[PDB]
Amino acid sequence: EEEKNQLEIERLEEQLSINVYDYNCHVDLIRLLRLEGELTKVRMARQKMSEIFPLTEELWLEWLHDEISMAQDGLDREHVYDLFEKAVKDYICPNIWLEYGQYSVGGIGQKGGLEKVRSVFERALSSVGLHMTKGLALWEAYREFESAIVLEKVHSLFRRQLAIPLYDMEATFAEYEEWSEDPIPESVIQNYNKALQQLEKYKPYEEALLQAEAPRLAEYQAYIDFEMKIGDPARIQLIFERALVENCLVPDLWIRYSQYLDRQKVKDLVLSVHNRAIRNCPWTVALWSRYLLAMERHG
Ligand SMILES: [Cl-]
């Protein structure tokens, strides 16, 4: 069935030359070639797809996994890091960050390898460390890394985490008590209580998301309203980003994120968000207008 396959490879290719904006054709084309072992054409197809489209976490991770295995030396490794840097730009991506962290720990023996690992985890925590269901895996991964080389930094990460509302933060408090020789300070006990209060406050909104059907737009918009009432810029940014993972083809959501950012010392953030907006909703003239106004405003 090689001739059968090659025929449908050529058909999909012709269909892409007819219309490059056919997402499923790209995916179908790439799926074949990975099985067929045409490693060169798979990489080229992935490169071309990723120029045209923002990719989901799953699509990125399939690519990254193949490239990790094929990387043999320090230079190949750097090109894999370049691929991670491209990968993390599209949407918030806790699993890509976890894999970036693990790959970096794999390269610990590179010169500067320790700094690279800590940079990766700190950057991950900056993006997803407040994520109520998915942030905890990154705090735990970072603590397991820091433990495996000591141990004040592990105290730091327990205490930093416990100031933040996350699911299973009760278990982390118990863990920290049992782990710590000394007892936990009062300030950290006080912030933990404040964080538990926050957690309870957010629980109805999280439950609404989990209960509602995908892509749960109304439940996201209500959560966004709620966080915008509360006013923490990091939290507002996070909820927009969570909503956009599932609602990336909704121009109104990007526009709302853009309006919020028009009221902010954050040039790099503003311009990266607008680029992502036009990659996801390229037919929306208002988003292109907004992107160019933002560039002028920040020039
Ligand atoms: Cl880095």
- The residue extents of the domains of the chain are 2-298
Name residue 39's amino acid: L
The token duo for 265 is 């010392």
SS3 annotation, the chain: CHHHHHHHHHHHHHHHHHCCCCHHHHHHHHHHHHHCCCHHHHHHHHHHHHHHCCCCHHHHHHHHHHHHHHCCCHHHHHHHHHHHHHHCCCCCCHHHHHHHHHHHHHCCCCCCHHHHHHHHHHHHHHHHCCCCCCCHHHHHHHHHHHHCCCCHHHHHHHHHHHCCCCCCHHHHHHHHHHHCCCCCCHHHHHHHHHHHHHHHHHHHHHHHHHHCCCCCHHHHHHHHHHHHHHCCHHHHHHHHHHHHHHCCCCHHHHHHHHHHHCCCCCHHHHHHHHHHHHHHCCCCHHHHHHHHHHHHHHC
Q: What angle do CA 147, 153, 154 make, to 5 degrees?
A: 45
Q: How far is the CA of 116 from the centre of ligand 1 (A)?
A: 5
Give, as residue ranges, everything with CB less than 5 Å from ion ligand 1.
Answer: 119
Identify the residue whose tokens are 């994120």: 257
Among 169, 171, 159, residue whose Cα is nearest residue 200: 169
The token duo for 203 is 């629980």
CA of 46: how far to CAs of 21, 32, 71, 90, 261, in Å?
14, 12, 17, 15, 32
State the first-to-last Cα distance of the chain, in angstroms, to the nearest integer.
57
The token duo for 176 is 């920290």
The token duo for 143 is 């603590």
- Which CATH class, in words, describes the domain spanning 2-298? mainly alpha
Q: How far is the CA of 145 from the centre of ligand 1 (A)?
A: 16
Q: How far is the CA of 144 from the centre of ligand 1 (A)?
A: 19
Q: How far is the CA of 229 from the centre of ligand 1 (A)?
A: 33
**What is the biggest distance separating any 2 CA atoms in the chain, rounded to whole angstroms?**
72
Q: How far is the CA of 19 from the centre of ligand 1 (A)?
A: 37
CA of 203: how far to CAs of 136, 214, 242, in Å?
16, 18, 16
Q: How far is the CA of 249 from the centre of ligand 1 (A)?
A: 30
| Sign of the alpha-carbon dihedral angle for 239, 241, 243, 245 | negative
Q: How far is the CA of 119 from the centre of ligand 1 (A)?
A: 5
Q: How far is the CA of 279 from the centre of ligand 1 (A)?
A: 24
Q: How far is the CA of 205 from the centre of ligand 1 (A)?
A: 33
Cα 16 to Cα 208: distance, rounded to the nearest angstrom:
40
| Sign of the alpha-carbon dihedral angle for 187, 193, 194, 199 | positive
Q: How far is the CA of 64 from the centre of ligand 1 (A)?
A: 16
Cα 248 to Cα 90: distance, rounded to the nearest angstrom:
10
Q: How far is the CA of 278 from the centre of ligand 1 (A)?
A: 26
Q: How far is the CA of 265 from the centre of ligand 1 (A)?
A: 22
Q: What technique solved it? A: X-ray
